[PDB]
Amino acid sequence: TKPGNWSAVDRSAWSVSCSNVYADDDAKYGAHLAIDGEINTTWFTWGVANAGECWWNTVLDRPVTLTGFSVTKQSAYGSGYNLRSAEIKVRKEGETEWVTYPRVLTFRNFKGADPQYAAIEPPIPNVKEFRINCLTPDNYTGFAEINLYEKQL
Ligand SMILES: [Ca+2]
Numbered sequence: 717t718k719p720g721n722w723s724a725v726d727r728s729a730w731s732v733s734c735s736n737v738y739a740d741d742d743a744k745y746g747a748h749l750a751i752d753g754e755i756n757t758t759w760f761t762w763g764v765a766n767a768g769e770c771w772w773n774t775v776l777d778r779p780v781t782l783t784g785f786s787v788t789k790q791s792a793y794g795s796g797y798n799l800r801s802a803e804i805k806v807r808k809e810g811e812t813e814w815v816t817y818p819r820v821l822t823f824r825n826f827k828g829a830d831p832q833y834a835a836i837e838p839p840i841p842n843v844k845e846f847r848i849n850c851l852t853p854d855n856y857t858g859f860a861e862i863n864l865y866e867k868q869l
Contacts, residue, residue: 718833722783722865727751729777735769736761738792738856745792747772750862755829760792760858763850770850770857776843779809780866783839785846786831787823790858798826799859800852804836809844820851831861839867 734747738760750759750772764770789798804817821834846864850857 717830718786719784719835719865721867722833723868725776725778725780725864725866727774727863731775731777732773734759734761734772736767738762738858745858750859753861755788755860756791758790758792758858758860759862760790760797760856763852763854763856765854766856770854771847772850772859772862773845773847774864775845776864779842779844780864781839781841782806782836782843782846783865783867784833784835785848785865786833786861786863787848787859788829788831788861789826791860792858793856795826797853797856797858799823799850799857802851803849804834805847805849806840806843807845808840808842810842811844814845814847815840829860831863833865 732747738745745760749757
């Protein structure tokens with residue numbers, strides 16, 4: 717379900733963080749587990765209703781012209797905690813102010829390990845930092861793999 721010309725951005729030099737780590741167990745549910753390439757490890761946290769906020773953030777080492785992103789199920793608990801809706805903010809390189817993407821992104825029921833793709837239109841040039849504020853579910857949520865995409869040559 718991935719647009720043909722999207723290229724996943726290499727994540728190994730990303731610096732990632734999140735609002736909270738479920739059970740304060742960083743090794744088991746920490747932010748970095750969302751970008752390790754493995755469906756069976758996941759970021760997982762309290763939703764906005766409990767903890768007041770719910771988000772995952774990455775500082776990119778190489779800024780990109782962002783064409784979209786993708787998320788999978790979380791694999792910590794039942795599918796009723798998979799991400800349902802989110803809002804995105806980015807910060808462009810050299811800027812101290814953040815820009816909000818003005819559309820709520822909504823996801824359907826995930827199928828196995830398959831990601832769902834959310835387009836960023838038009839692509840946003842020079843994204844240095846990316847945050848996803850998870851709106852629902854508001855009790856608990858997370859995701860096992862997130863990727864950001866840029867246009868291939
Ligand atoms: Ca993972």
